[PDB]
Design a protein around this ligand. Sequence first.
Ligand SMILES: Nc1ncnc2c1ncn2[C@@H]1O[C@@H]2CO[P@@](=O)(S)O[C@@H]3[C@H](F)[C@@H](CO[P@@](=O)(S)O[C@H]2[C@H]1F)C[C@H]3n1cnc2c(=O)[nH]cnc21
Lengths: 177, 177
Amino acid sequence: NVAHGLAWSYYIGYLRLILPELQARIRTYNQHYNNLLRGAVSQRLYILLPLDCGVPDNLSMADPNIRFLDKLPQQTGDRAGIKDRVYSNSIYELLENGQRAGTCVLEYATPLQTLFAMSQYSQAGFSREDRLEQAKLFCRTLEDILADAPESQNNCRLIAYQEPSLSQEVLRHLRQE
Amino acid sequence: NVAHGLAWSYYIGYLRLILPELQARIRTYNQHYNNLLRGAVSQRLYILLPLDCGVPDNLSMADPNIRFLDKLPQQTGDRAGIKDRVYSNSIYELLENGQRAGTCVLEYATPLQTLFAMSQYSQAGFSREDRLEQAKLFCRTLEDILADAPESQNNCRLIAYQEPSLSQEVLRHLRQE
Ligand SMILES: Nc1ncnc2c1ncn2[C@@H]1O[C@@H]2CO[P@@](=O)(S)O[C@@H]3[C@H](F)[C@@H](CO[P@@](=O)(S)O[C@H]2[C@H]1F)C[C@H]3n1cnc2c(=O)[nH]cnc21
């Protein structure tokens, strides 16, 4: 349904184009930019998938243990008539007991915002109960696309969750690899 | 169908967020940046909508009479966990008889690329004959959304066309206003 088109739109428009050349940006940020004494940013992009489609624009305010650190060197590409369209990513630190536990490139999945707004708009004809299924369907279709993909070899880890600690949730995924 | 979700995704993710503050960027580009002797960039964003979903990434190579001139001051905004996500636009000149006839902010509608790719991917389950309808449906739903919209007051002009001169086609729209 709607999530299927958004899931493919996510892969074709963003993931297919930044995942193949994300490791090099992380290498550049670790070697030439990262504080000489603050460890290394992980090699994988971690994508948050809140099934309730609650996607705040600032990660830091969604969890005190998560706070912005830096941005990777931005990626530019001529896209659909725009010269040097800028694809940017933000590096975040994860705090356990007040000490930095993990550093990674973390972001939400923006198509989930689009689903949330469509449920809020009258002309979209989208219901709140419809949203919760489309949120799950979006994650499924995204998983299927990345399962056979020449860009998500070891570049992309999905983080889905339903709320009855996000920092502990993300940390859980980093330590599994 | 798929186009409906992409059409709303286009409005909610891009148009709702740059149209309200596009005129000011054009003013800044005309007053503080534009060559003192090259006229003024139009106040409206013109969006190309090729119904065949053929969307080249460089406008200049799609028509010799269209050629890149400059970029507007980029718009930044914290979006879905990305700090200072950059929304950029490119200014193009239109050539009639080899002399500059019009200058405007011109770009393709990227969701049409997404539709084209989905028709090319096996797992998407999207057909080429399905595409041509979804291309039309995408334009219709976009028109409906902008018809009652507090951001497309006089900010956005859609340019749809089917190929049996793009520069003459775009020029035709500028002179109607
Ligand atoms: N830089 C990025 N950072 C993070 N995620 C990104 C980025 N780029 C793409 N994605 C993801 O890929 C999806 C499809 O993207 P696409 O190529 S089809 O174009 C998108 C969509 F049609 C719609 C946005 O909706 P949304 O964000 S929920 O979906 C996106 C998003 F999930 C309007 C278009 N649009 C947005 N911003 C710009 C811009 O600056 N220039 C030109 N067009 C732009």
